[PDB]
């Protein structure tokens, strides 16, 4: 699906997270899988009650993610082209 492909297109850019536990992890996205579980680098953390800390590396489970904020300039990214023309696939 497109929503996950946009998350793969956001690698290496600052993103925000909301876990369903209520916390907020904002920082740079290193890895993401098709299970939506991502790992982030040099991230600032906001606990559900507002206490903010800083951690260098984090890995979160995709099932616990609520929304992900992605740099706005990915809006016009080619994933959202409705009528697009692909070439023929290679024969293997």
Partner RNA sequence: AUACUUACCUUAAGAUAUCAGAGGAAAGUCCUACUGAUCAAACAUGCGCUUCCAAUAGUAGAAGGACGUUAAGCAUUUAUCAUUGAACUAGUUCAUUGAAGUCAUUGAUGCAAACUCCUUGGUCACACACACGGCGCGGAAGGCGUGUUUGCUGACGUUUCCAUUCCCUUGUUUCAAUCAUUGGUUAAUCCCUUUGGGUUAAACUGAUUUUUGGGGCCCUUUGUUUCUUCUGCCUGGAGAAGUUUGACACCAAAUUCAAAUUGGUGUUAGGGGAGCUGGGGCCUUUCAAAAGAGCUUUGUAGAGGCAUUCUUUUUGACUACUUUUCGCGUGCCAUUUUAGUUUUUGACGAUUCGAAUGAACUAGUUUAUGAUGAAGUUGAGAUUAUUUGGUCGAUUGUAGUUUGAAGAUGUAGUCUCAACUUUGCUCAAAUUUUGGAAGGUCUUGGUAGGAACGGGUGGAUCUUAUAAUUUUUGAUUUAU
Residue 28 interacting entry, from other proteins, RNA, none, C-beta within 5 to 8 Å by type: none
Tell which one of 5, 52, 67, 71 touches RNA (CB under 7 A): 52
Q: Which of 13, 42, 63, 75 binds RNA (CB under 7 A)?
A: 63
We find the least distance from the C-beta atom of residue 13 to RNA, in angstroms, to be 19
Q: Where are the strands (E) in 1-92, listed by range?
A: 14-19, 24-32, 38-46, 52-59, 65-69
Could you list the residues that contact other proteins (CB under 8 A)?
1-4, 6-7, 16, 20, 36, 63, 65-72, 74-75, 79-85, 87
């Amino acid at each position: 699906g497109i929503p996950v492909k946009l998350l793969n297109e956001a690698q290496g850019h600052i993103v925000s997270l909301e876990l369903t536990t209520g916390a907020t992890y904002r920082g740079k996205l290193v890895e993401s899988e098709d299970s939506m579980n991502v790992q982030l680098r040099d991230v600032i953390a906001t606990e559900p009650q507002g206490a903010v800390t800083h951690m260098d590396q984090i890995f979160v489970r995709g099932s616990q993610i609520k929304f992900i904020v992605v740099p706005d300039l990915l809006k016009n990214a080619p994933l959202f082209k409705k009528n697009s023309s692909r070439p023929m696939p290679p024969i293997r």
